[PDB]
Amino acid sequence: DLPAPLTNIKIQHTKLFINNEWHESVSGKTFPVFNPATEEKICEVEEADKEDVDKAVKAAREAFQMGSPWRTMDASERGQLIYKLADLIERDRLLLATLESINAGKVFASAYLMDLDYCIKALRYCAGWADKIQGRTIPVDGEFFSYTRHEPIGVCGLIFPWNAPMILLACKIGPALCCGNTVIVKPAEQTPLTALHVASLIKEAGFPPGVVNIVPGYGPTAGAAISSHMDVDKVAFTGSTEVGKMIQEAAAKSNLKRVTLELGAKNPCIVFADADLDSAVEFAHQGVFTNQGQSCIAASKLFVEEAIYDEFVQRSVERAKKYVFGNPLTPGVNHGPQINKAQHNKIMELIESGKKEGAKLECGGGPWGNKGYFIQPTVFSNVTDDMRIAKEEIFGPVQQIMKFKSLDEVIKRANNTYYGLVAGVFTKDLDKAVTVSSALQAGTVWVNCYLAASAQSPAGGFKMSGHGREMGEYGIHEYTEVKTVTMKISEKNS
Amino acid sequence: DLPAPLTNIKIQHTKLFINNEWHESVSGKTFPVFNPATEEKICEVEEADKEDVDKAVKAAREAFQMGSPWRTMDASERGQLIYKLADLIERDRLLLATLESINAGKVFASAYLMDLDYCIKALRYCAGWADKIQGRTIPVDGEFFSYTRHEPIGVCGLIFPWNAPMILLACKIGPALCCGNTVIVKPAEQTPLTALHVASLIKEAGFPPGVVNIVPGYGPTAGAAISSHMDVDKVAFTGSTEVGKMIQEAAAKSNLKRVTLELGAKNPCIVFADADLDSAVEFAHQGVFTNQGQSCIAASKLFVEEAIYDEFVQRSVERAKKYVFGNPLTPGVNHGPQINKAQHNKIMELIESGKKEGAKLECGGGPWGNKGYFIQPTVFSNVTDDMRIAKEEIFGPVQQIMKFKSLDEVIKRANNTYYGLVAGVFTKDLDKAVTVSSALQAGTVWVNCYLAASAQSPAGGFKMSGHGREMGEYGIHEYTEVKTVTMKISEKNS
Amino acid sequence: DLPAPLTNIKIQHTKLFINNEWHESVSGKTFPVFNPATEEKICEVEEADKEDVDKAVKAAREAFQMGSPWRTMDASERGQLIYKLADLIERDRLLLATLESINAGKVFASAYLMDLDYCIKALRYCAGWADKIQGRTIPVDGEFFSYTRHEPIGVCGLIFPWNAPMILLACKIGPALCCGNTVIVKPAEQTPLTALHVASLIKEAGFPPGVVNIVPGYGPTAGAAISSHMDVDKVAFTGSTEVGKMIQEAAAKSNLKRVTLELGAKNPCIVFADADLDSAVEFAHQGVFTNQGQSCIAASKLFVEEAIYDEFVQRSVERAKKYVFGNPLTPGVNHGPQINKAQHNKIMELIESGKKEGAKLECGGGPWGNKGYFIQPTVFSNVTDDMRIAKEEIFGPVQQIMKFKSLDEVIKRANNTYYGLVAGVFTKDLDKAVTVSSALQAGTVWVNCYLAASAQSPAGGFKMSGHGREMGEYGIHEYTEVKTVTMKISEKNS
Amino acid sequence: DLPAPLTNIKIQHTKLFINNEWHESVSGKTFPVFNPATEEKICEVEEADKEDVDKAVKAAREAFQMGSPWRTMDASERGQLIYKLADLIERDRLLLATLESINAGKVFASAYLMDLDYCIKALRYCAGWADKIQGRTIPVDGEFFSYTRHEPIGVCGLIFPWNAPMILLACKIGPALCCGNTVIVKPAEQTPLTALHVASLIKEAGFPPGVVNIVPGYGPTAGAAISSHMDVDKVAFTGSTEVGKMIQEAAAKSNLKRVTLELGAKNPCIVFADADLDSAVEFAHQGVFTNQGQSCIAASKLFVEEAIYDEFVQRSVERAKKYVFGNPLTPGVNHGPQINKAQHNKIMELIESGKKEGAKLECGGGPWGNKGYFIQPTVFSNVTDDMRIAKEEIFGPVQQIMKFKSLDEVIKRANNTYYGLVAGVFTKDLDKAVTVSSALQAGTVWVNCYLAASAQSPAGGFKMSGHGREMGEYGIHEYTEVKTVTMKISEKNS
């Protein structure tokens, strides 16, 4: 069930969050935050720079020192505290979802029923792992007792984008904290507000001071002070591919801090003639147009077998005409705006290029209205491999539909790309499903569904979509460091 | 490729194997061993009894004492000794496959190409696991360091049937020895011979005395001495269901020793209309007619969907006439005899119930030849759930073809049984393949194949087909005993 | 930390709990429940026999049918419900502790601070495993995709004693529910009351009907009907070795249900001369005398090195003199009664046997008061291996103190026993700690502490103290059944 | 007993190995290779540059294509190929040890008894892991079947140093090959000859062509072509810290390939007052002076407690005089040369900074012999924290003995460094052993031993000693990439 959004929500939390207290920027500067549906200023937030980052890192190092309350408390206690944070986010679910909507342009129902729900579930999952992270006893050669410890890494920097502020934040801090690390959080400059509200709940939940620090700010300033800091042990980064290159570089030229990258995507989704046609049209559609295309996991190219091609295209055009734009808080609106003017412009350039290079425009292709950064649902057929809308990430409401003839061809083309985050496959045949999913070079493959991400399963990129995994067993374990202890004993019995 | 079999084998090993030496029996009694194809006595073997088992248990307890060679040896050295046993069985492959054919009635091609091949790779799978058995370090509540050790259990008794002497022996002593246990092997009275040759290979490979002891003999004497012994820690039994119930009670009345059981089977096999019919007919045919039906994993209930049913019965009867009985060492022969008269009588008494209860005989139904215990490849149509031939394990070359009309009803009918060792499912629909194999109450389900076991997978019964698993990670780890050590420490840090 | 007990608690729940409803017994019979400190009847409780168990089993079997809410529910959702049960138990903590005190004779501050706390922590641990139980994908030989599933077993009978009612209950239903089983709970006839109150919280928590059924009653009636039932898939039993023999047998002669056993104990405790003496005396004291010795993990035999023997004994006797017996709800009382006349007399026969066989009585050795089943804390010195107090489990406030001289001797002596549940070792030396703890034949070994069980550590017996483990990763996985699925594929790539 | 070295070995293999064929360099240039004990030339070796790397990468890619022999062979068969390579190195043990001594200046007894033994065991361990690398089946939210695959990554560049050619080669090709990757091997320019002989044995074992390619050459040319290649999926580097940063950077600006890093070291070793002093001097001496200081795992800083300091010093000086320098091949020699002139220079630079900074020269401190790159075993006492000899890696026969008094101060001091590969602790106390080893920030901690590396445990850096681990379960799994496959099903039951 879905409540009504808050009518007169007020912004309360705008300061930096360091050592469980609220700080002004060292410089005294603030930066503005805009509603993308109206273009108007919501508020100004304290702007973090290198000198604020230094303060956050000192506090996180102190919280991590041997004998501190966060290091000596039972693993199960780390767990209870993460589970309590989940309880408070659930209690404030209406507030947090109204605020996601205002700041990031998300359809309200989507933000309440999906984003907030996934964020609460990710934290609860992670909470359960805290006392079940285990090492090994090893029957090594020789007269030794040998074992391993999965220890916390230390101080972790968490840097991420604007498209899903609550989910992104949950899936970085959840794994980090349940392994016992302390953290420095740098949310995207476009959408800092829900991150700062979660900070007020971290103090309420009873986290020790310095365990979680949240410093809103820009990229070359705050983001780059974290990646090159000499006393940060790890940075987990989600964002664009070009910036991930700068992060790896920064890490190398400073202290060789561990790096995790989750970067750009152009995700293929393949529909064979033997697929359930209706279900695939619907899933592939939601694949591309969810959050107005503003999603790393969206279906960006649609390979559709020749016999069902014309009929797939026709049904996708019809499905795309069922949208109403406006303020995402208004009931009856299911198409929000793009995040800002820069993004809007990148999307329109690519749309325009598709017309230029001779893809066929089926519907949309233009901006929507006069105010707010709205773009029409846009579908393109007769798309060929070497067009720009086929290669470049659009991050907008733009579907590409292409023809394919045989199986071995469509695998070749779906893999002919420097990206590899996610891929779809639709077929009701057992052997086809298994062998094609194995053959696709992507870290997640969805069979007969799309957007089916869960907390229990690891997700991440092949190739230039990044390295490392988030969530599941495997992803949680990436916030640990392994130590082997090997002790001499006087006699050894098996 | 297939060599020719040995034409005149010297039987060298007929004595009990205890502490790496050969012993006559305490009583002096021997028992005869017969070739099922010719009825001729191959040799007499030394008959072990309670007092011989008593000797064997003392040798295995001595070999398991702390400070002994077998306990102080590096785990990777144990694995190396098991790899060496496999190399020695491989050098003697031709000899062992001939001997298995002569004693067990196994068609030479199956025994050389499948049984010896599987037995070799099984010991090699287990060899690798030895230095990879690992416990845990655990972040327990309180100021403690806690870990587990997966120790060896102790002295293990291993009792098995006659249907596949080399495979059964490998999958029991492989796992048991890789975890560091000592063992008392009790092969079937019908087929003790190959196991005695393996004894001579264990010796030359260099296993410490008393680690492996073999004592051939009868069940109510030597077997019962093992299950009832106050100093045997675990018994692993493969055999009939009624005998498994005796094992369990004797364990309880003596020393509550650990029990693993692998019992009777009546395995269903379900073929839907959208299956590859050529492939499915052939696989179901292999599954029932492999080893003259003398296999626990044999298909015996063929549920076939009504629209392909008549065709499947016609094609199955045609495949069934491509056979040639005779001495299983003869080139060309692909149908052997059954193990002895008591079993030949039991199969004929079930076959006649088939005629009498209304099933229609499509082919066979009678005895073959003059000498030896041969039975004709028999097929029955129109079989229903109430008939004895659909309820009782036949252990013979007798196919039952049953009809089904719906998915829900046939799952129901395959599950309505106290058996559950194995099952098979033939369909090319992804959804049917996954949902039906999840719904079947059996330890192994094979999809679009049959008789497709591997060393790397675990195997065993649901319900009254047994409890416990053999092979794979999980099955290997069932020959360990878990010990927690928890030590006070002065400070704890994550 | 600790409130005042409820002064006049009123018994609310006394009926059988089946299908989320309160049922009268079929026969009409009800059985009495007594307060062990006054010998007065508290109330009568409904008495289940065979026919009531039969209703419990059909309800558990229906809740476990495919398609049912309990089966189709997500695993994270099972977890949620169990964590909610832990919250309601936390909410009713004072109520359940008063009632535990009254029924079982536990000192109230122990019941509140230790038993209720451990009960809440165990459920929360298990809740966390619900969506982290995982099978494997296995690279088998051949063109196959092969995987395992850790399925729930089915209907589980859960039968336990009277010494820690709330801990026993958590540690059975927690692991079983988190795996997705349904259950029949047969609490001890001495102490059915807190179990029945928990049953009231199962409904409030929102478990589907039939997932948890509670049937109070006696052993040979309610218990034997469960263990011998044809539609119960597993029985987990805790209790006397003699009854454990009967359960194992009943399982054999009914349906070979899986059995797990956690039986009698006589736990050795070794104190070397190079230990923290002060702390060893106090730990060993709490080990013996906590819950008036009515605990399977209690220190019975106390081996103490010759050089420090006389001093250890002086300190132990002095430490045993500081007790005030009386009503377990009364402030300043730290010694409750034994549970009933049958146990009081068992313990008095064994105390008298110590006097007769020549051990030196240091303190106590008789009853306290003339109403209630109180026994003076009792200490024997000069105890030898042949005396009955050194061999038999007493389950009462009686400490045995024995001399030893050499390390190799004391190890033999502590391992010379059919029991093997727990052991203790006290030394400051790394090498002694590790080698002696490896050498002791017990399921748990505590080094420089005692009573240090946690929810994340497995626990269970060697030899005739049982088989199977409870809690930790390993114990939780004993409530699953393993299925291998192997599918034929047209091509395989690594 | 130990055999004598081969008397007049002839170098057989000097060319690049690509596609199981021997190639001349594309330019036709070769580079010289020197015996460090005589200064004399051994042979010239083809010098790979960028154009040669491009050929090897091309062959690896071709050998990794889906459908190829190395992709479609069973995992168990990759294991048998790796095990055959090890049997063959065992057979060529005498030849390979001798050649390792000649090229790497390693004492012969060492090269034969330790290095060759370790390299055979490491390969046999990884062989065991091939068909035991196992993904997961996952109970995710929703109506889905979800599982993971641990696939091979693809083309892996392997770059390493000259201090233990066979060990480093085995510890990288073993984990890489056993997960099913193909590889480009880049041996150090100073010690390529053993790599090349191993390339001949790879061919003989029957590996598919292209699976292992070996391109000897210089670092700025062949090494940097590997790390900058657009078609190389992963680079595992072992070497100096300085060069490790360039690899990380070159990977960023090319294709964001996966990077593993094992770098410089300055390993602490703390010896407490209550330690077995005799054992501790021995292990500590061996720790430093093995390989004449040329091991990254060598002890470099010895912290010795005040009560035993002077005795530790004078005992270490006596131990340092048991050395006879010369050609490692002449009987009696147990002290070999450093590798070349530039290393011989760095070491003496630092030894002379020892004299000038304050430290007391107890023995050695200058060069040895007329010819060769020998240095006297050198011990320093009274060493302080700010000295260059206590901060920078010496990689030579130089022991630093420093004094401490407090457990808390020595831990801070041991951890106050940007390095973190290995550490040592010597004590008889249980509590100090566990707590100090838990507090040290290093990847391996050895307690009451040193140089106790084993194949079954993981090893690698904390901080700027690198990231990633090698060997053991966790190390083997670093040469995989996780793919999640989530399929829609029509019904889900637990």
Ligand SMILES: NC(=O)c1ccc[n+]([C@@H]2O[C@H](COP(=O)([O-])OP(=O)(O)OC[C@H]3O[C@@H](n4cnc5c(N)ncnc54)[C@H](O)[C@@H]3O)[C@@H](O)[C@H]2O)c1
């Ligand atoms: N579950 C499985 O993996 C599996 C595998 C192969 C065979 N089987 C079963 O084995 C049966 C055929 O073999 P079988 O007839 O030799 O079985 P069986 O019960 O007649 O004898 C099996 C073994 O137990 C011994 N034995 C007999 N009585 C005993 C007693 N009282 N105490 C101790 N040991 C005793 C026998 O001497 C023999 O070694 C079939 O029912 C088949 O399903 C099961």
